[PDB]
């Protein structure tokens with residue numbers, strides 16, 4: 087089997103991407119944030135505290151003939167940005183892009199933090215990291231990918247995110263029309279439950295490539311590129327008037343600037359992030375200070391190849407017995 091779904095920016099900055107997901111019978115379509123940095127499929131629901139819902143579409147398990155309470159199971163998650171949700175668990179039929187899983191754990195939110203409530207465009211998350219991170223207790227549950235894997239034509243999914251445009255998530259096949267050149271595969275460590283890999287180095291603009299190992303995660307649910315402070319300083323040093331602002335919470339630059347590209351290594355291959363991808367616009371409405379898309383990881387504990395980086399590539403998440411990542415230009 088295979089599946090193929092379009093993923094769409096939630097706003098003009100590509101702050102996140104939503105993908106329609108069918109849950110239940112008859113189908114209830116919710117727009118979920120596909121997140122390769124977490125492992126819970128959770129949704130706004132008929133159980134979510136009413137004051138914490140503001141425009142989301144909700145899953146109502148009582149309207150699904152295939153929903154079953156997973157008796158005694160609870161979940162609770164906290165994300166890198168300080169956001170959180172928790173609740174109880176149903177099993178139900180879940181379909182993405184024509185690929186169906188029966189008996190998928192659907193984590194129904196009873197509580198969500200303010201950041202979720204304030205985003206009407208995101209009805210929940212679909213985690214695509216390793217199932218060892220799933221938070222369901224007392225019986226840990228599998229991701230949609232892990233449940234689909236044995237049925238897929240190939241045990242893979244691919245992320246092809248757009249710059250200010252829709253893109254695609256495919257399951258079970260590699261669309262050879264979706265990228266240019268060849269795919270370079272690189273080793274993955276699953277020790278922390280992430281798609282963790284080692285970049286071979288970087289370049290700023292037309293500058294020389296610096297060969298250096300940068301260990302980080304491929305995380306579709308993180309907007310920006312978070313790298314070591316040395317790398318980030320070297321990038322922003324090439325932008326007149328850029329500075330790190332403690333008041334704003336990262337590097338800002340004059341909105342009059344033209345940003346250089348950023349290149350990262352994948353083995354002997356190179357992925358180029360155009361400068362425009364690194365512009366996240368005014369820090370507040372009407373400001374002439376703009377927020378940068380490359381930020382320091384120093385206060386995180388891990389480097390994160392988030393959407394800024396991933397949207398510059400066709401990315402293969404190879405879930406074979408020994409997982410690997412693949413990157414191609416596009």
Ligand SMILES: Cc1ccccc1CC(N)=O
Nearest residue numbers: 102165167169201205307
């Ligand atoms: C949308 C999302 C994804 C991962 C973590 C947290 C969020 C909420 C946010 N807007 O900061």
Ligand code: NA
Nearest residue numbers: 309335366377
């Ligand atoms: Na921000």
